[PDB]
Structure formats: structure tokens, C-alpha cells
Symmetry: C3
Subunit: 280 residues, 3 copies
């Protein structure tokens, strides 16, 4: 795989996300994630999956801002998406319905679709000092269209969901945990051993226990919410701002490490600059 | 000009400053003015965000005016024009809950009863850690919250904590309210103004249609059955002898004065004991 | 004072106190389940009682977990089962009785509660715990099963599915601060203040005027958990039926479960049984 690596042993698969320079989620990663998770879902030797990043600053930056430039790659993904779920929601929805226990180890920054990925897993543990979660979408003239509005509604409640989405700020681990967006914030220097212990302890459970727990606690019914989000999100592309802001962002350094570090700041200054065409 | 509110706007943010001396009770006048101002603002394309704050240095909104039943005609007109299946008190929070703009409460001081209902109804509430307080005083006046509070709490904090807030009737500090999810965040008192201004400006700066899209994706909670159940529970308690005795006794012992409102919980417990 | 084997009940001024006392570690056995039903059914009909406070006589354990030998005397368990509510299993019947009680129910948690003990704590209207000393865990996964007394659904409602899965599958003992942050209990308080705190809340609620408690509960009715509880029963029943579960439980008893020394670190004890 070109955007990730997988290894498994002792009932735990580790999926390490590695797509330089900032771990954007592009069409290739979306396809490779589907392949790896679909294959694992049929592997009776694997009981737990742990997602981590190889990038020292970013878990998953956000969805590739150039993803709409090659609609054919996107059209192929959209054709394999489940009923009533859009091509972006299909990533989080695959994670949410995975048979294995899914665990995210979050050390760095995850925004937009990356933050959706984090919230979709069964459990997420984040480094107190270094981790960050933000829904950057509003600053690109859109809203989350990959399940984020609904994952937030369910985990943090509507009031805090609207705050996360509309302030579009980068939330630190301690705030994200107190909101319930992730399970726990832990010291950065303890996080790796903590997640390894949780994963191995869950994988050591007797046969059938994980299955029973997931049957007793089935995935939330989000069908109507995901449809509503899709409709609202689709409508934001019928307005000119989204493409102006996405183009302006790329011009000003989005999807480079310096540009992504304070993406919120970068996108607000792009909006303040307000460049656009003049066809007089 | 309004007699209980000051309204202004700039850079896409309307400020509504609550100003009804001596302790910022929600009376019939304020209820009428709020309907007018929020309905006017709902169709104002220049306004994206509404921030509520208080001109009183101790109280955000004390609670509903305990003398509001002395002038039944103004209250009855408001009741006659309330939305279907929403009582006249619930109509305050319900108007806030369905406002098109992002609604933000900046809570520096104490809010009880209907005041606490108002805080919980806004899209977001940020409170001063050292100075803010939230409580449902209703149980101490022999009733339960009848303006949406039971259902706002159920949604925000869960039934277990909602029963605790309602039946203990204690004044919660900002830190505990935020932990519970009753408000969004507790911030230092000397940072709250800047924090709220930054959030308000950032949301007002979002491009056309984003706020609308977010609210479409995150529609207001369906509370119809819960509000009707609260209404019937409230009417039943209000009809029993203790309610009017406690309300009259509280007024005689200094409720709705700043000295009485400071520790309203202790005052109302003492009224019941005496 | 000697009305019951596993409980002491007293009441005055509108507050009933139920002290849980079944040495050596406050296991929930068939006798406690029967006595709890008697006491709570009686109080439900007592207009003079407005608040029920549950606490423990055991300095280390609130309620350890359900008696690991409860299946050895099927007749006692059969009578309890035969008379459980429709769509509610015999273990769920304990939490469900507490959930539908007319009085305000309050748990004062100073020590450790696991399994059905944690389910009990979560079922009350409100639970206050000592920050320094209290602990809550769902041990069931380490015995080859899942919670079968409502705990999956009480966790789902109070902490959300994500944290419910974490609690159930890690099977660790959660401290009071973490449990409160998650919403599993109402609040963590200093150990030396907890008793006065709870007494104050109970007294204050009992002093409320006629009809207020009743109105509050009418406005905030118990969650509908019918389908969740049915699902939990089938998941629990299927795992419990397997030899692996039966050997883990047998080994736990062999290695000192249900003794104070074995119960202090039950998680470690049960992980050692499985490794052996």
C-alpha cells in the first residue's frame, strides 16, 4: 500500500498511516483503507485494530483539497459507497461497522475528514500535550460532509457540535476528552504503552466476548442524520465561496507542513484576503 | 428603544444586553420585548450571531418575576400568542432555540430558574469561572422548571444529573456546569469577554450559507412530548398550596432584591422552615 | 435491626437509609436480591418516605459483584427469575427495580463496586463517590462474559457507546474522577466530605414541598431500555453458557475470589486465572 502499512500479530492489527507530506486523505488512501479494512473484517485471526500515524505532526490532515480535480477516481469510490451514505461518509461508516474493536492513537493534529476518522473509531486516546482535533470545513465555506456533524452530535451533543463546527477551532486533547469527542487524554510519553496495553488486553479476552459486547452495544442509528448532513453539505458547493477558498488555501500553502500547522489561521487570512475573478 | 434590553450590532454580531433593575427578573415586559427583538433580528441579513449579556453586575437573569401573576392580562396575551404545544414560559427558551442566527450567552453572574433555562436554550454558553452561577430554584418555590429547563437539562446533562440539578436546587458553579455539559465552557472572568468576542467575530465572518448548512445538519432537538409532559407536571405543582405560600413568603423576606437574590437558595429554604 | 440477612433499613424525617452488609466482601447473592426486592417494594408504597440512600457497612466494598456460586442453588434463583418483570432477566431486575422506584434514590459510593455492583450504582437516580477511595469496574469480560444486569445499557445511556465499549472491554477499575468525567456517576467528592454531602442532599430533597419529587420524576421519566436489555440478555446468556466462562469463574473462586484479599485487585486475579 502506498499510503499506509499494516501488520498483525497476537490478534492485533496495526494500521500506520503514512502519506507524505502531511497525511492528507486522498482518493488513493480512501481506496486502500477500504481494501485493508474489508480484508481484515474477514480475518478471524484479528480481534483489535489500532490506527496510528507515521507523520510526526499530523494524524490525518484533512481530505485532499485537489480531490475534485480527478472526478473519475472519486466516481469509482462513490460507486462502491453503501446506500444512503456519500463517498466521504463511507470512510467513517466503514470504521463504525468494523467487526474488530477499533482504537485510534492520536498524537498529532487531525482536521476535517481526519477528525471524522478519529471520532468514528470505537475508542480514541490522545496525547495531552500534542494532539489536536478540529472541523476545518466551515473555514473552507462548507460543513463536514463525512459524518462529522453526526458523530459530534452523538458524542458531544448538539450545543457543543455547533460550537466545534462553527468556531472551527483546533481543540486540544483535554477539551476534546471533557466534551466526549474522544475517550481520554493521556500524557504524550505514556500514550504508546497505554494503547498497546488496552489493545493487547482486549485481544486477550476469551473467544466471543468482543462479539457479544458489540452485539449488546450496536452502532448508532445515523441513517437520517447522515442524509441530512449530505444534503446540507452538497448545498454549500452550490455557492461560490467553497472553490474560491479551497483554491486560495492551496495557493497560500495548505497541504504543506507550515501551512497545516495553523490551518485555521491560514484559512481565515485567505477569507480576509478574498481573492476572486474579475471578468468585466 | 426597549425598556428591559439594549440592542446594537456591528460586523455581523448583534449584542442584546439584558437590563431590568433591580435584579434582572424576566417579567412580562421583557418577554414581549424579546419576542419583538428576536423576531426582527431573525430576518436581518446583516446579523449572523447574537450575543446575550447582562448589564447587572451580579445577575444575568434572576428568574421569572415572582409578581408576574399580579398582572395577569399582559401574561395572558403572551400565552394566547405562544406557539402550539408550548406554554408561555417555555416560549422564551423555544424562541431562542429556533433562532436562525447562532445564539451565544456570555454568563458572568448568577442565573436561576427561567434565567438558567434561557442560558441553556442558546446554541452556546460561555461562563466566568470565578463569578458565574446556574441553578434551578423552582423546587424551592414548590414547583419544577416550567420553561423547558427539565428537557434542556435532560438533553444536555442526562436524566441523572438533570434530577440532581432540579431536586437539589443548588447553585452550580461554572466549572461544574461545564463538566456536566449544562454550558459549553468555563473561562477565567478576565478572558471571557475576549473569548466570546473572538468566537462571535469568527462565526460572523464565515461565508454565506455556512451557518444555515450547519443548523440544517444539526436541527433543534425534538422536545414536543417532553415539553408537554413538563407543562402538565408544572401545572399540577403550581396548583397545590405550597407554591403561592412560598412565592409570597419569599417576596416578604426579600426575594427580588439584590440582598435576597445573593443566596436565594438559603432564603427559600428558610421561608419553608418558618 | 435483624429484619434481614444482608441489609439494615432505617427511616426518619422522609429519608430511608439502606445499609448493604453481607460479609466478607458484600457479594450480591440470591438472598440480597430477594431482600432488596422486598424492601424497595415496601418503601414504594410508603408515602412517608421521599428519599432512599444506599451505602455500605463494608469499608472496602460497596457491592463486590454477583455471587459466583449463585448457579449452584438453582431453586432460589428460579423463584427470583419466575417473578422478574417481563422482558427483564433476573439480574437486570435489580437495576430495573431501582430505576423505577418512586422515591429519589441516591448511592453513596466510598469503596469498590464491580459487575452487578457497578450496575446497581449506575441505576440509582444519583451517585456520589469518594475521590480517593471509590472504584467502578465491569469485571464481566475477564470472566468470559458481558454485563448481564443492565450495565451495558446503563453505560450506553450515561457515558455513550464509545466509552461503554471501553469500560466493558478493558474491564479496568475506574477511579471516581474518571467515572464522574465520563458521566457514569454524578460527582466525585473528597472522601472526608462525602458523608455530610450526601446527608445534606438527602435532607434537602426530603424537605421539598408535597408533589415536587413526583412532578420531577413525571417530567423526567425513566429511559426506555426495553430493546437494549433484551439484546444484552441474549449476548450475556450465550457467552455465560460456554465452558470457557465456567472455567474462569471456577478458577477465580479457587484463587481467592470473594475474599477480601482476592477482591482488592480482582482484575489482576482474573487475568492470572486466564493466563493459568
Amino acid at each position: 500500500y502506498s499510503t499506509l502499512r499494516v501488520s498483525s500479530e497476537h490478534g492485533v492489527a496495526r494500521i500506520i498511516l503514512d502519506n507524505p507530506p502531511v497525511n492528507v486523505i486522498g482518493a488513493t488512501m480512501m481506496r486502500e483503507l477500504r481494501t485493508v479494512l474489508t480484508t481484515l473484517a474477514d480475518d478471524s485471526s484479528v480481534r483489535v485494530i489500532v490506527f496510528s500515524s507515521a507523520d510526526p505532526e499530523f494524524f490525518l490532515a484533512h481530505v485532499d483539497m485537489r480531490i475534485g480535480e480527478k472526478m473519475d477516481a472519486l466516481q469509482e469510490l462513490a460507486a462502491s459507497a453503501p446506500a444512503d451514505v456519500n463517498v466521504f461518509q463511507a470512510v467513517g461508516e466503514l470504521i463504525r461497522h468494523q467487526p474488530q474493536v477499533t482504537i485510534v492513537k492520536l498524537a498529532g493534529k487531525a482536521r476535517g475528514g481526519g477528525a471524522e476518522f478519529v471520532a468514528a473509531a470505537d475508542m480514541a486516546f490522545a496525547a495531552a500535550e500534542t494532539a489536536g482535533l478540529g472541523q476545518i470545513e466551515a473555514l473552507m465555506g462548507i460543513i463536514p460532509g463525512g459524518g462529522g456533524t453526526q458523530y459530534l452530535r452523538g458524542r458531544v451533543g448538539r450545543n457543543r457540535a455547533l460550537e466545534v463546527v462553527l468556531t472551527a477551532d483546533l481543540f486540544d486533547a483535554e477539551t476534546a476528552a471533557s466534551y466526549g469527542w474522544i475517550n481520554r487524554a493521556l500524557p504524550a510519553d505514556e500514550l504508546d504503552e497505554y494503547v498497546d496495553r488496552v489493545a493487547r488486553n482486549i485481544a486477550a479476552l476469551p473467544d466471543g466476548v468482543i462479539e457479544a459486547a458489540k452485539r449488546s452495544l450496536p452502532a448508532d442509528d445515523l441513517k437520517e442524520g447522515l442524509l441530512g448532513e449530505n444534503d446540507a453539505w452538497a448545498a454549500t458547493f452550490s455557492l461560490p465561496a467553497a472553490q474560491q477558498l479551497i483554491s486560495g488555501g492551496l495557493k497560500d500553502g495548505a497541504q504543506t507542513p507550515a501551512g497545516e500547522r495553523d490551518l485555521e489561521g491560514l484559512m481565515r487570512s485567505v477569507a480576509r484576503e478574498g481573492h476572486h475573478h474579475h471578468h468585466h
